[PDB]
Paper text:
[name] is involved in the early steps of TA precursor synthesis, where the first amino sugar UDP-AATGal is suggested to be synthesized by this aminotransferase, followed by several TA biosynthesis pathway steps. The three-dimensional structures revealed that [name] has a fold characteristic of the type I aminotransferase family. Two dimers, composed of subunits AB and CD, are present in the asymmetric unit of all the obtained crystals of all forms of [name], with a buried surface area of 2490 Å2 per monomer (15% of the total solvent accessible surface area).
This region of the protein could be part of the substrate-binding cleft, which explains its high mobility in the absence of substrate (see below).
Author numbering:
A (entry chain B): 3 to 237, 246 to 408
B (entry chain A): 6 to 404
Write the structure that this text describes.
């Protein structure tokens, strides 16, 4: 039969050999391969420097720490995102401010974003959900429009003298917006190389920033390095510790996976395109409505096949997932809005303030999208998801 | 001669390859099996394998809910990571000076440093040598009336909790018991340069105690290490187990099966690695006997050290003379190191008000300290060369 997994890893013998090479070398933690991966990633994202770290969460947190966002500052995040986009705000002691999304897309309602901005707002964190990059022209217009609310209180906040926009591009390595690669669009960007992502090092990620005359790239790179490795500096036993910092460097074991993945990535991206186009033609005219991966402004890296089923309640969506599972099709939900989660409910966030986020979630189902899918499996998912959705609704009507 | 190259064989490589061909490249069955095997090795009920010792020590503090207004005692003579985690959770580090003839805290001064705010003591098992736990447990008991619990786990103990920094001490013993089983909680390090390596990694464990439910405690670490994510019984039993909750906005420091693969093989190899380190230490020890080079003892009445660092102090040497000796070792093709600058020498801790003049014993230990290479890629000929060169060089610098 079929037992189609949601997100198995795509590892070949080339990854294994490269990792083996590292394990024979003098360098098994951070070494030359990590530096080479950062160099190649920078060229790929059209940014001057990249800091490879052990997760996207570590990257996003370090961006916030480099910006010195902390107690008394506000950071804006969508109500519809993964917990990790928000949790790093609480880690640095800042106040998350959630903004509701639009009716026909995951993106923040940018009018409501404008309204949420205060004198305390330091950072906006858009999420490039499923690889689809946000309306950056509008986002930059908002921060410029509200520039007079901004009051810098750190080195880097003074340099930019406005709200800094930090892309959560966990899902978006290789996505483009008006022809420009994610990484080059926002002021800072985090990427994720987690086991389930398009590009994987099992655990990993990176921080980068777009070229900007107010940033010395070597100085910025060095500040991340210091925060990722205990605050340690050297001017050969002697070192100093300048701040009691963290431990989130990338190993050459992981960088080895990355280097091979990056060679493979154009082909991987192409396969995902072919699967999305097959799904898209398959769901045309049905109740199954996918998020568009190709728009006038965006070419998505096609990380998640996010769908919403027209007319389906919460209960009905949950039943459909369990029926897909009985048919040998794994599926997922991206995402529970943050206010549904105990941690954020406990911080006073209330789901009734973000009805659009709720309505997106309510009928959302993510189908498998990865490079181990055969065409036959995709065809099977298309036909099954239609038959199952119809069955559940015809059952409800009855 | 390098200071600390990794000792990786084809068995590690094959095990990692096996993982890379499996469905599981991040946290998976190999990580759970490594935790199980490590728990048996350390004689503890459960182990939580994570991405660094620093992660493990932090999480212990976060499980204990040590935070703002609490004090955590650490030695003045330790690595920055023993202390930095205290600041991470927002607690106040309290440093204690060490003894004249060992790295260990002066336990009288430890008693004096205890207040109503003290929640945790972090001894460091320097070079693999385990601290005087009988004395440490006597101190916390003696001062029990200073303690006022302010969290679930603090109430359970109802005293200062003793957390071992065993970064250097996987496989060490104290009165025949393995590090891991001695302190209330223990962190271990599997960093590239440690006796047992996963390139980056570490663990948290805890000794058996009736007031701890081991599965509940294990589950709390898991949750903190992986975003605060939980799933209920109903969600796990369903064929489609997507639904989760986030209970606290937690952290991201889980161990991958890639790293656990290295660990499993290292753990099979570990008795033999430990034996080789013993043989090197004994050779150094006989070599330095009667000289000015005084090594820390790896075998005592109470301790059998895992023999992670060969820490030495050169009698009669000033700061400047020590530094010259290191550079002369380096010209002779011998890498060496210093463990450690006392914390008050470091800008970060200076900046928090810590003053080197308060910890003269820590300074004096550091001043004439040289660490010689101790790892399993050393040949006997290299060890003999280091012995005879270090003696000649020291004599030359002093003459």
């Amino acid at each position: 039969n079929y037992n189609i997994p949601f997100s198995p890893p795509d590892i070949t013998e080339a990854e294994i050999t490269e990792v083996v090479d590292t394990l024979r070398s003098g360098w098994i933690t951070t070494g030359p391969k990590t530096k080479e991966l950062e160099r190649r990633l920078s060229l790929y994202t059209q940014t001057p420097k990249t800091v490879c770290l052990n997760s996207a969460t570590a990257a996003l947190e370090l961006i916030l720490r480099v910006l010195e966002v902390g107690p008394g500052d506000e950071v804006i995040v969508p109500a519809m995102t993964y917990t990790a986009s928000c949790s790093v705000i609480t880690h640095v002691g800042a106040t998350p401010v959630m903004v509701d999304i639009q009716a026909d897309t995951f993106e923040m309602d940018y009018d409501l974003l404008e309204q949420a901005i205060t004198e305390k707002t330091k950072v906006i964190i858009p999420v490039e959900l499923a690889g689809i990059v946000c309306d950056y022209d509008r986002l930059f217009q908002v921060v410029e429009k509200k520039r007079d609310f901004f009051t810098a209180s750190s080195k880097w906040q003074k340099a930019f003298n406005r709200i800094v926009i930090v892309s959560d591009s966990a899902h978006a390595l290789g996505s483009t917006y008006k022809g420009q690669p994610s990484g080059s669009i926002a002021d800072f960007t985090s990427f994720s190389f987690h086991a389930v992502k398009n590009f994987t090092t099992a655990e990993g990620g990176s921080a980068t920033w777009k070229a900007n005359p107010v940033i010395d790239d070597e100085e910025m790179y060095k500040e991340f390095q210091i925060l990722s490795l205990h605050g340690q500096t050297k001017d050969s036993w002697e070192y100093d510790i300048v701040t009691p910092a963290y431990k989130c460097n990338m190993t050459d074991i992981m960088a080895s996976l990355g280097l091979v993945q990056l060679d493979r990535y154009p082909s991987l991206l192409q396969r995902r395109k072919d699967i999305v186009d097959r799904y898209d033609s398959g769901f045309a005219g049905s109740r199954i409505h996918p998020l568009a991966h190709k728009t006038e402004t965006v070419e998505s890296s096609r990380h998640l096949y996010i769908t919403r089923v027209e007319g389906a309640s919460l209960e009905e969506r949950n039943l459909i997932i369990q029926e897909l599972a009985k048919a040998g099709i794994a599926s997922n939900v991206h995402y529970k809005p943050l206010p549904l989660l105990t941690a954020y409910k406990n911080l006073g966030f209330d789901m009734t303030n973000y009805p659009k986020a709720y309505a997106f979630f309510e009928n959302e189902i993510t189908l498998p999208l990865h490079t181990k899918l055969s065409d036959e499996e995709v065809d099977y998912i298309i036909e099954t998801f239609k038959t199952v959705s119809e069955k559940v609704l015809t059952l409800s009507k009855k």
